[PDB]
Ligand binder design. Structure first.
Ligand SMILES: CN(O)C(=O)CC[C@H](C[C@H](N)C(=O)O)C(=O)O
Ligand SMILES: CN(O)C(=O)CC[C@H](C[C@H](N)C(=O)O)C(=O)O
Ligand SMILES: [Cl-]
Ligand SMILES: [Cl-]
Ligand SMILES: [K+]
Ligand SMILES: [K+]
Ligand SMILES: [K+]
Ligand SMILES: [K+]
Lengths: 253, 253
């Protein structure tokens, strides 16, 4: 009955440093939608945890030798018991680690500065002018690296080519959409949040696919099922919809 | 340490009635790639099983009230412990049941009678003449019912419309490709097998996506993990590639 190791990274509004005048330490340093989720699971399931930020600051992708990085690596290597973060359940990652049932559903879409009236990814694929891209070693990059659709094959061709098109993280990518003629391939529910705070930014097109965020565990983890079940209970009483509204509630445009 | 209930259905060359002069009963009635897989898992993991054919003869899809049928229903309702069959791991079904790690990877493609030189699904979507379709209440139908791609949205529009375009099973669909101007949306590894036996049939286009076949269990099943691990062991020694060659080895064209 020890404290579980939780791996995570910084992403508004899922995991953040809470603001204080004193210097925070431990779990107390963190807040956000996933912190509220983790707290709720800990309570329902009766466990405690120590939260640790993944050292490379990545979600996780396979390299060209088949090696993982990011939080995925952390679970593979059993350095963490859970990955609590906006981690995308992909069948590609399901060969290295396990997921709980999804706690949020989102799609890939396009974040872009209002102005040039593009309306779809076809518009981007067919031109070099507006540069686009994704977060390096994330699920949105991999989705493009793996796709058989000739549009997304065409788009990945472009990100593959350009050195500056694959950004280190979400924050840096949002910055590029604000300071360059640049379109960031991003996840839907984050686009929602971003475009509520940043009124010169908008979503382009609708969803480019459908997927879910899950809690990551090593393969054959004994908490996988307990967590899945609690997440489903929370979901059926629409608590997760309420938790989402709490952290997405913002100004307006 | 009781015998597990296995749910299954008839599909060449995964599950079949073996040929005998006497009347078979029990597990002895069955043979095929999945039978060989089930046998191997039983041996590695030390369990026994009673195989039962799902009464409605379906893999499983949600109706318009959210209700499941087929083998998916069988696991939900705990009538079976495992689904051993060419069952497609879809995130849609992962809300009702669990999957093991995949034992085979396949994509959707098009099975069609050689003649009219179509080369892609775009060709089908854009015309009414050659009728196409899929197996009713299967993963390939659902994939079309759920898709956001305007081509597959267009194709699903057509299957949705036509009463005869959604076939009862694989067998009946293959029959329609042979006796009508008709293209069956099917899974890759089955197309391989079919087109080796039936030389007026061919595959049109490449893969339309990527996915896997897994062993289905109810949610939070205690064999899910044991089975996943054994399947991975089998896979790393490339036994599953050998098992596949055993059942796909056929004449030629
Ligand atoms: C919310 N969030 O996480 C972001 O927008 C950051 C980048 C995401 C990460 C993704 N969820 C993964 O699991 O790789 C992306 O690759 O699009
Ligand atoms: C091998 N096989 O099973 C077939 O071709 C028959 C129909 C498949 C079933 C699919 N694997 C499912 O899990 O729904 C399809 O929906 O395309
Ligand atoms: Cl830390
Ligand atoms: Cl039976
Ligand atoms: K501080
Ligand atoms: K504890
Ligand atoms: K017989
Ligand atoms: K037994």
């Amino acid at each position: 009955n020890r404290s579980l190791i939780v791996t995570t990274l910084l992403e508004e509004p899922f995991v953040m440093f809470r603001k204080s005048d004193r210097t925070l330490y431990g779990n107390d340093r963190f807040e956000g939608y996933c912190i509220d989720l983790l707290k709720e699971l800990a309570h329902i399931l009766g466990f405690s945890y120590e939260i640790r930020l993944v050292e490379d600051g990545k979600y996780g992708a396979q390299d060209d030798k088949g090696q993982w990085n990011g939080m995925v690596k952390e679970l593979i290597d059993h350095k963490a018991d859970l990955a609590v973060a906006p981690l995308t359940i992909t069948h590609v990652r399901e060969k290295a680690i396990d997921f709980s049932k999804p706690f949020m559903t989102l799609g890939v879409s396009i974040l872009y500065r209002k102005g040039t009236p593009i309306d779809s990814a076809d518009d981007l694929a067919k031109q070099t002018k507006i540069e686009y891209g994704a977060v390096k070693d994330g699920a949105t990059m991999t989705f493009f690296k793996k796709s058989k659709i000739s549009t997304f094959e065409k788009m990945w061709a472009f990100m593959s080519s350009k050195p500056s098109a694959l950004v280190k993280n979400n924050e840096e990518g949002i910055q590029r959409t604000l300071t360059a003629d640049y379109a960031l391939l991003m996840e839907s529910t984050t686009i929602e949040y971003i475009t509520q705070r940043n009124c010169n930014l908008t979503q382009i097109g609708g969803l480019i696919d459908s997927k879910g965020y899950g809690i990551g565990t090593p393969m054959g983890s004994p908490y996988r099922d307990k967590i899945t079940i609690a997440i489903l209970q929370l979901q059926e009483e629409d608590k997760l919809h309420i938790m989402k509204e709490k952290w997405w509630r913002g100004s307006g445009c």
